Ligand binder design. Structure first.
Ligand code: CLA
Ligand code: CLA
Ligand code: CLA
Ligand code: CLA
Ligand code: CLA
Ligand code: CLA
Ligand code: CLA
Ligand code: BCR
Ligand code: BCR
Ligand code: PQN
Ligand code: PQN
Ligand SMILES: OC[C@H]1O[C@](CO)(O[C@H]2O[C@H](CO)[C@@H](O)[C@H](O)[C@H]2O)[C@@H](O)[C@@H]1O
Ligand code: SF4
Ligand code: SF4
Lengths: 69, 730, 220, 81, 161, 138
């Protein structure tokens, strides 16, 4: 019995659900609160929908000398 | 049933109410069963629970088609004969504008009968006899008058073979339930021994009798009724009596020849119907195969064989029940027969096979849309009848765990995909056009999708067209031109009345129709696919094979529970395909006339029925009634008081009949009941109604009288719209 | 010419009302549905069997009515204009021997007198009107797209949404992600409405843009 | 109502008459005299969908039921999923 | 080793669908997708936020800077931001008011690790509102921002051909 | 699942039955007897075999799992049996309860059949205006 090869390394096998990469690059808390105000999210969104959306549309429509429709 | 089985009467069943399931048509009177009786008249869940007969009927009540196709054709050969114009037209083509039919001047009639060629009053033709008929290695009016009764011969006889079945005490099982040989035979010698036999009567006789027609004469100043025997002396002009060769092989010398054939490709200058010097060789080169081919074979073996991992274990065993189905081995067929008809519809217009077509515009597009509605009306069918399988046919479930039991395994799946396919199309496949409007009506062309604004630049060319007309320089031998003159490379000179085919250019406005087809071909099929697949069971109804493949709708519950079934998937799948074909047609002529059809004169300055208006202007989908529907059709709505007039004069009805379908399509049912009684009341007062309980339409009958009308309406509408814009300029 | 339209506005409010009169004259019930009530109006549908029973709620006859109120109120309006049109910047003989028939009602009017508008997106730049013609095809779509709603009938829709809501649940980068309303197909009265309330704008938004888009040009 | 369609009749005998209809109808509840003595119109109906398979067979001689329930769960339409 | 895993429809029981074929569960793919919110919730939703915001970020440029409404721009405010620093914004609260279909109101902090997780019944929800914030907050700073090293990158471009 | 593998009703794959909404809400499942190894038809489109165990297949929703009868009693057997599983336990004991075979007599349970007044002349429409004091909540 040669091709009975005792499964040339069993593996263990099933690797896992276990463990075929560490995790996520150490880049993190290099944003800690950095950009907060959706990381102070404690009551907001009403603020960013008058603000952001009055300045994607206030100046965004107006213009000092057309370049018309 | 009953009177009076079984042994004990000859005495036939004329008289005693009913027959067709068993608290049958009941003594008690009603109307529904009079659409019953005709509908489902052919069917099989009744007649007997036992195969046997049915195949013993279908091989008979088949027959009476051939015989019919045979009573038909006769009145067409007769017709294409003594109601002449064929004699007249042939000495005089490029000139004539053919007829076969003519009225009789009763009532209004005559307007319909309007000078057509060799000097007579009649109604034209877009059905290219007068052009198969080129053939006649002979010519003569009374002659077709033999071919004609030769027709009624095959008929009466190929119609007493149908007495000489079912009614005669029939074959049985083995006879078909041994399949073992069937195609062995069919393809070998008929498929073969026709194409073969057709060879022998396609150079013998025809070739020569238009080899020296393509010049002048007046017939019988040519081609006698026997002349073409042993006399292998006129076969002298159109190659050797083999001179010193004996039964091909090689110890042959050519210092100057190579038998008839000497392969063409292109188009006769004087009769651009493609060359005949070929037409023998290709039919010969067919038959051989069939001649060799129909010599398999005896059956499983070959399908009981190649399986795999995910592949089809049941591939192996792909149906004992493919000798025990029909409804199965019909539905398969229709997809092919059907899908193998509209492949005609191309090789025709971009490769005419009859003398005088193209020049003859209207007498081969009629064709390319008639052939086009079968390669579609036969395909939705080719699905219906699979649904008819998928529901019932076999006795029990003996068929098991295979290719199918597989496909079904996934099923909320194969149709899960296909769906998104369509909304990806549709958004890329129609709103595409709508951009244009919204932004060309906004108006800024900079940014449309024009054959010129969105980046594409004065060329389409580099693809495969341009490596087709140019391929006679491969393994290719050759023979001046191509294969189909409509290809990119070289040549022009085609015809001396009007035009025929030339390149046919592309890019966008060819790019995107070609894509609407995709999305149109696809969502058609979605509804038939999921329709036939979910035939018998589901998670809206599982108790759902319990009557038949029709059934109206299960019931108000589950939310909707109406359409479901698969009569109906083969009811809303017609509904699409009517488009599928109805817009493909819309495509061809707007091309084929916007470019191609048009015309030569000095310096052959080409002058299309329309200077390519297509250009920048089908891309707008209004252009499709600016340039189409409102442009052409001005010949339909001018057509009164003429000769054709029967088109404009249809085009109102049938453009009415459609706008009557919606009433059948769009409405309830205990409605026309609730109404049919008010009626039934007023009826009784005078004493005039009850007997034969008058009743409204059978939920799904109602849908039957939608659809069928919506089509014979919405369709002949254009059948008119058309013949009225090729007769008369074009 | 007027001794016909005038009999075909008369075949409208009559037919329109045999159905409304009827619609009404038993939201109560009848033979097929005897006890048709406690809810009368919009109970659209009923089970199959008995004879086969359907749009037999007094709503679905109202539903059914609104097609002839949309076919009278068209023959009638249609009529004025052709008349007026001709009776302005030109003739009247026109409506005379050319409204005594039918084809012609389509040809000269319908087919004559649209001219102006449609060659207004024209392959040769946006000319006079553009709102109108795009409306007029917006007119032909909203219409047509009635039909689904109308030849579709909740059954077929719901079921492939049964397969089409096996997606998400079975596909990554779009799992967990919960709806809060369970994917279904439209109610069995609802779509008789929506095809309509759809059939209608299309239709009423097409003459809207049709007449204007041609009483404006003229010639009249 | 929330499943209220009346199929009642007068025989409420159920032999070569009617059975069909997913779960809903556990009857045979013999009322003190009605021929083949089994009667009424339903059992506990808070279980299944909205058929009229309910008649289609065995009399209701009047109406026959259909959808009328409005208040409509999901379990009460296939699709809560 | 076998014919294809120990041959199976799903993880196990064949009465759930999924019909685990390839394109479903080949170690060839199922690993190209689980540092992220496929099988397991790494760190919280906090950080995944911006690799999601950003990656999806510098997309939507040539889509609306090379297919822009009047296209191939000679405006120094396009070949980048221009407007589309609108999409991320029209959809960076297309999200927040979907995390209102999440409430469940807590504060544990378990992005640090303890005993080889499972998050167990990790299916269904088990990510409250104070999670879906720190993601769709990672989204804005991933969207707006991921729009500028698009823009900011000059453009050295490969062309037609 | 596997570490506990307790099966009975053979199948292999299928994109048919059970999916997300049979955890997050209710469950539904049918059970049965049988003689010797026989190949069946199936709800959800597919088809497999039998022999025994519990013979306990689990099913998406209960209209689905009685159709083993609407054919799975045209294939012998008294006994077929479907219950109701939750994500936690009971109330709704589905084919459990008392007797079985819808068309016998032990008790009467529910049903009624009448409303207030019977099928008779309800040309009488809707009566009172709905008002919290006169027996129209039934
Ligand atoms: C090889 C093919 C062919 C054959 C032999 C059959 C055979 C059969 N089909 Mg079938 N079918 C086919 C092609 C075929 N089909 C195609 C292409 C389709 C797609 C449309 C269908 C769609 C179809 C359906 C939906 C059904 C069948 C059914 C059947 C069975 C019923 C036959 C019957 O009673 O006649 C039916 C014919 C009539 C009752 C005559 C009415 C024809 C009207 C609509 C006229 C058509 C319009 C025309 C312009 C009118 C004449 C002109 C007028 C203006 C003067 C039978 C076994 C039925 C079944 O229940 O299975 C057992 C089922 O109804 N077929
Ligand atoms: C003009 C048509 C109208 C429209 C728009 C549709 C559209 C559709 N039908 Mg349909 N149908 C119709 C009439 C219509 N039908 C009628 C009259 C009938 C029978 C009489 C049917 C019978 C039918 C069947 C049996 C089927 C369909 C299916 C479909 C879908 C196919 C996939 C697809 O490409 O959709 C998406 C694409 C479009 C709808 C076209 C583009 C729409 C444009 C205008 C873009 C608009 C988007 C834009 C963002 C607007 C937002 C702006 C804001 C102001 C709102 C699609 C939803 C099938 C299906 O669902 O398969 C996938 C199914 O097979 N239909
Ligand atoms: C191309 C078409 C065609 C053909 C070949 C047939 C052939 C047949 N039909 Mg048929 N049929 C057709 C179109 C056709 N039908 C249409 C359009 C309808 C309207 C629904 C029917 C409705 C119909 C019914 C109700 C019946 C048939 C039957 C039959 C068969 C009986 C033959 C017989 O008894 O004596 C032949 C008799 C003569 C030649 C005597 C002369 C009669 C005139 C018409 C000629 C035969 C197979 C019978 C059947 O079930 O057989 C399969 C049945 O009774 N058909
Ligand atoms: C394929 C089709 C079929 C069709 C649709 C027609 C149609 C027609 N034939 Mg006809 N015919 C046919 C087969 C057909 N025939 C066959 C097989 C024969 C051989 C028996 C004939 C022999 C024939 C004659 C002798 C005549 C017609 C005539 C006609 C026209 C007279 C109308 C009529 O028959 O009733 C009324 C009409 C256009 C008549 C005609 O051409 O004068 C206008 C003429 O009477 N036919
Ligand atoms: C299936 C066939 C069809 C049929 C029925 C015929 C029949 C005939 N051919 Mg013929 N032929 C055919 C196809 C056919 N041919 C084709 C496709 C070609 C060219 C590719 C020819 C080239 C050809 C030539 C050159 C001659 C014939 C001759 C004949 C006649 C006697 C010799 C013979 O071929 O068979 C019977 C076999 C023997 C007599 C041995 C006979 C009438 C000859 C003739 O005129 O009569 C003798 C002779 O002239 N054929
Ligand atoms: C499902 C299972 C089993 C498996 C695992 C495969 C796997 C494969 N088959 Mg395959 N095959 C199978 C059963 C199987 N087959 C069966 C039963 C049949 C007969 C029905 C075939 C008939 C077949 C053909 C004709 C081909 C394959 C090819 C392939 C390969 C695709 C090329 C590729 O990815 O490299 C390409 C990678 C690059 C980086 C370049 C892949 C290894 C293709 C092949 O030979 O490789 C291209 C080839 O197309 N198979
Ligand atoms: C011509 C113009 C415009 C410009 C300047 C860019 C520029 C860029 N695109 Mg892009 N894109 C555009 C239009 C444009 N796009 C359009 C219209 C679409 C339609 C979807 C896309 C879809 C798209 C995708 C899906 C991706 C990009 C990517 C990229 C960037 C990576 C370059 C690269 O190939 O990786 C270099 C890789 C290595 C050196 C390794 C790059 C900055 C990405 C990318 O290119 O990564 C491969 C990402 O792939 N684009
Ligand atoms: C009997 C015979 C034959 C033949 C031949 C044949 C047997 C031929 C045939 C052929 C066939 C064909 C050629 C076909 C045709 C078809 C058609 C034409 C159709 C068409 C169409 C289409 C396309 C589709 C549908 C419609 C229609 C119909 C139109 C013979 C026999 C023999 C013998 C034994 C003895 C010696 C001699 C011989 C000779 C050896
Ligand atoms: C009013 C009417 C009619 C109408 C009509 C209309 C208003 C319409 C109709 C239509 C019909 C139709 C229409 C049929 C047909 C047909 C055909 C023949 C077709 C063919 C085709 C084909 C082949 C396929 C598809 C395409 C087409 C369609 C072409 C009538 C009335 C009356 C009166 C007074 C009383 C007595 C009776 C009468 C005398 C009757
Ligand atoms: C209008 C309409 C009706 C009413 C249509 C009817 C009643 C048509 C049937 C009329 C028959 C054909 C008249 C037959 C009478 C003559 C054959 C008798 C005299 C014999 C001749 C000599 C005249 C339905 O029944 C229906 C059913 C389901 C969905 C939609 C609809 C639908 O839209
Ligand atoms: C398509 C279709 C569906 C499917 C349901 C669909 C497609 C709903 C799809 C949603 C569309 C895309 C919403 C777009 C509508 C917008 C104008 C927004 C509506 C805003 C409202 C509040 C007014 C049915 O359920 C149905 C039921 C009965 C008869 C016919 C049909 C039918 O034709
Ligand atoms: O009216 C639109 C017009 O104004 C813009 C908008 O940014 O900005 C002007 O404002 C600055 C501020 O100093 C001025 O210097 C100069 O006019 C513009 O930068 C400009 O885009 C628009 O052209
Ligand atoms: S009428 Fe129907 S179910 Fe009612 S009592 Fe009879 S069969 Fe029973
Ligand atoms: S009629 Fe109603 S109660 Fe009866 S089975 Fe159908 S749904 Fe259930």
């Amino acid at each position: 019995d040669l091709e009975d090869i005792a499964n040339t390394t069993g593996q263990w096998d099933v690797y896992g659900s276990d463990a075929p990469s560490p995790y996520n690059s150490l880049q993190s808390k290099f944003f800690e609160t950095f950009a907060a105000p959706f990381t102070k999210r404690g009551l907001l969104l009403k603020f960013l929908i008058l603000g952001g959306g009055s300045l994607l549309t206030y100046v965004s429509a107006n213009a000092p000398q057309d370049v018309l429709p | 049933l009953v009177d009076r089985d079984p042994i004990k009467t000859s005495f036939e069943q004329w008289a005693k109410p009913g027959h067709f399931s068993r608290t049958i048509a009941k003594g008690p009177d009603t109307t529904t069963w009079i659409w019953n009786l005709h509908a489902d008249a052919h069917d099989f869940d009744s007649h007997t629970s036992d195969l046997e007969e049915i195949s013993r009927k279908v091989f008979s009540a088949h027959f009476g088609q051939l015989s019919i196709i045979f009573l038909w054709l006769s009145g067409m050969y007769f017709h294409g004969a003594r109601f002449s114009n064929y004699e007249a037209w042939l000495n005089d083509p490029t000139h004539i504008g053919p007829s076969a039919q003519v009225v009789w001047p009763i009532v209004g009639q005559e307007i319909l009968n309007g000078d057509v060629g060799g000097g007579f009053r009649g109604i034209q033709i877009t059905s290219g006899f007068f052009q198969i008929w080129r053939a006649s290695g002979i010519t003569s009016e009374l002659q077709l008058y033999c071919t004609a009764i030769g027709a009624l011969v095959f008929a009466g006889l190929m119609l007493f073979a149908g007495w000489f079945h079912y009614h005669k005490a029939a074959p049985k099982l083995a006879w078909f339930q041994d399949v073992e040989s069937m195609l062995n035979h069919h393809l070998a010698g008929l498929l073969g021994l026709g194409s073969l036999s057709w060879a022998r009567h396609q150079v013998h006789v025809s070739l020569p009798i238009n080899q020296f027609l393509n010049a002048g004469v007046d017939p019988k100043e040519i081609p006698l009724p026997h002349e073409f025997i042993l006399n292998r002396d006129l076969l002298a002009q159109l190659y050797p009596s083999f001179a010193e060769g004996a039964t091909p092989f090689f110890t042959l010398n050519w210092s100057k020849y190579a038998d008839f054939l000497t392969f063409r490709g292109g188009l006769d200058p004087l009769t651009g119907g493609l060359w005949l010097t070929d037409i023998a060789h290709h039919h010969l080169a067919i038959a051989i195969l069939f001649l060799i081919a129909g010599h398999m074979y005896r059956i499983k073996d070959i399908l009981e064989a190649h399986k795999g991992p995910f592949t089809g274990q049941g591939h192996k065993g792909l149906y004992e029940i493919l000798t025990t189905s029909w409804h199965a081995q019909l539905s398969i067929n229709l997809a092919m027969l059907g899908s193998l008809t509209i492949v005609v519809a191309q090789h025709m217009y971009s490769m005419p096979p009859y003398p005088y077509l193209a020049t003859d515009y209207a007498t081969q597009l009629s064709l390319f849309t008639h052939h086009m509605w079968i390669g579609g009306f036969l395909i939705v069918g080719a699905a219906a009848h699979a649904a008819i399988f998928m529901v019932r046919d076999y006795d029990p479930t003996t068929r098991y765990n295979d290719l199918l039991d597989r496909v079904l395994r996934h099923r909320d799946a194969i149709i899960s995909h296909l769906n998104w396919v369509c909304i990806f199309l549709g958004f890329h496949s129609f709103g595409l056009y709508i951009h244009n409007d919204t932004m060309s009506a906004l108006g800024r062309p900079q940014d449309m999708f024009s054959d010129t604004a969105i980046q594409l630049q004065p060329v389409f060319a580099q693809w495969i067209q341009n490596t087709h007309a140019l391929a006679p320089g491969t393994t290719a031998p050759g023979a001046t031109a191509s294969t189909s003159l409509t290809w990119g490379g070289g040549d022009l000179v085609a015809v001396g009345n009007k035009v025929a085919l030339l390149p046919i250019p592309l890019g966008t406005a060819d790019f995107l129709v070609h894509h609407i087809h995709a999305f149109t071909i696809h969502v058609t099929v979605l509804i038939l696919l999921k329709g036939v697949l979910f035939a018998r069971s589901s998670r809206l109804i599982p108790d759902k094979a319990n009557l038949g493949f029709r059934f109206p709708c299960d019931g108000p519950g589950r939310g909707g529970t109406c359409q479901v079934s698969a009569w109906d998937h083969v009811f809303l799948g017609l509904f699409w395909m009517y488009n599928s074909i109805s817009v493909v047609i819309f495509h061809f002529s707007w091309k084929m006339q916007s470019d191609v059809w048009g015309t030569i004169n000095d310096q052959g300055v080409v002058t299309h029925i329309t200077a390519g208006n297509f250009a920048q202007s089908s891309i707008t989908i209004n252009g499709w009634l600016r340039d189409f529907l409102w442009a052409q059709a001005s010949q339909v709505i001018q057509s009164y008081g003429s000769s054709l007039s029967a088109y404009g004069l249809f085009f109102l009805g049938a453009h009415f009949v459609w706008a009557f379908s919606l009433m059948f399509l769009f409405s309830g049912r205990g409605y026309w009941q609730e109404l049919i009684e008010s009626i039934v009341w007023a009826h009784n007062k005078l004493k005039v109604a009850p007997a034969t309980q008058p009743r409204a339409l059978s939920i799904v009958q109602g849908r039957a009288v939608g659809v069928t009308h919506y089509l014979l309406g919405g369709i002949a509408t254009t059948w008119a719209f058309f013949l009225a814009r090729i007769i008369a300029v074009g | 010419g007027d001794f016909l339209v005038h009999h075909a506005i008369a075949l409208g409010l009559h037919t329109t009302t045999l159905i409304l009169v009827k619609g009404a004259l038993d939201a109560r019930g009848s033979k097929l549905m005897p006890d048709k009530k406690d809810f009368g109006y919009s109970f659209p549908c009923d089970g199959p069997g008995r004879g086969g029973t359907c749009d037999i709620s007094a709503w679905d006859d109202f539903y059914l009515a609104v097609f002839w109120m949309l076919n009278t109120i068209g023959w009638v309006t249609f009529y004025w204009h052709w008349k007026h049109i001709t009776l302005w910047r030109g003739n009247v003989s026109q409506f005379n021997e050319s409204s005594t028939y039918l084809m012609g009602w389509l040809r000269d009017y319908l087919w004559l007198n649209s001219s102006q508008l449609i060659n207004g997106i024209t392959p040769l730049v946006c000319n006079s009107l553009s709102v109108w013609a795009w409306m007029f095809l917006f007119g032909h779509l909203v219409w047509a797209t009635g039909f689904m709603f109308l030849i579709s009938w909740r059954g077929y829709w719901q079921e492939l949404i049964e397969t089409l809501a096996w997606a998400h649940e079975r596909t990554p980068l779009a799992n967990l992600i919960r709806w809060r309303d369970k994917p279904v197909a439209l109610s069995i009265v609802q779509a008789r409405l929506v095809g309509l309330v759809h059939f209608s704008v299309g239709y009423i938004f097409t003459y809207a843009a049709f007449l204007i888009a041609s009483t404006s040009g003229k010639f009249g | 109502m929330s499943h209220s369609v009346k199929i009642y009749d007068t025989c409420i005998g159920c032999t070569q008459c009617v059975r069909a209809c997913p779960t809903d109808v556990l009857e045979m509840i013999p009322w003190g005299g009605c021929k083949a003595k089994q009667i009424a119109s339903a059992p506990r109906t808070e279980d299944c969908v909205g058929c009229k398979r309910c008649e289609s067979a065995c009399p209701t001689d009047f109406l026959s039921v259909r959808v009328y329930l409005w208040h409509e769960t999901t379990r009460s339409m296939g699709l809560a999923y | 080793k076998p014919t294809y895993q120990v041959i199976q429809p799903l993880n196990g029981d064949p009465f759930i669908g999924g019909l685990e074929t390839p394109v479903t569960s080949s170690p060839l793919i199922a690993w190209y997708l689980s540092n992220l919110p496929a099988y397991r919730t790494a760190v919280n939703p906090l950080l995944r936020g911006v690799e999601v915001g950003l990656a999806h970020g510098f997309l939507l440029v040539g889509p609306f800077v090379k297919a822009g409404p009047l296209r191939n721009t000679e405006y120094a405010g396009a070949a980048g931001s221009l407007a589309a620093a609108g999409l991320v914004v029209i959809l960076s609260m297309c999200l927040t008011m979907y995390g209102i279909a999440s409430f469940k109101e807590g504060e544990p902090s378990i992005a640090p690790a303890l005993t080889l997780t499972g998050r167990k019944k990790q299916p269904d929800q088990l990510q409250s509102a104070d999670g879906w914030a720190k993601f769709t907050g990672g989204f804005f700073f991933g969207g707006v921002s991921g729009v500028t090293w698009a823009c900011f990158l000059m453009y050295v471009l490969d062309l037609p051909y | 699942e596997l570490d506990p593998n307790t099966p009975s009703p053979i199948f292999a794959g299928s994109t048919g039955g059970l999916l997300r909404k049979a955890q997050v809400e209710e469950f539904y499942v049918i059970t049965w007897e049988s003689p010797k190894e026989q190949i069946f038809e199936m709800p959800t489109g597919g088809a497999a075999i039998m022999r025994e165990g519990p013979n306990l297949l689990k099913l998406a929703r209960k209209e689905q799992c009685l159709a083993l009868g609407t054919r799975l009693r045209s294939k012998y057997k008294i006994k077929y049996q479907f219950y109701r599983v939750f994500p936690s336990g009971e109330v709704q004991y589905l084919h459990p309860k008392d007797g079985v075979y819808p068309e016998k007599v032990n008790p009467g349970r529910q049903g009624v059949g009448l409303n207030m007044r019977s099928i008779g002349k309800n040309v009488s429409p809707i009566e009172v205006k709905f008002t919290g004091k006169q027996p129209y909540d039934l």
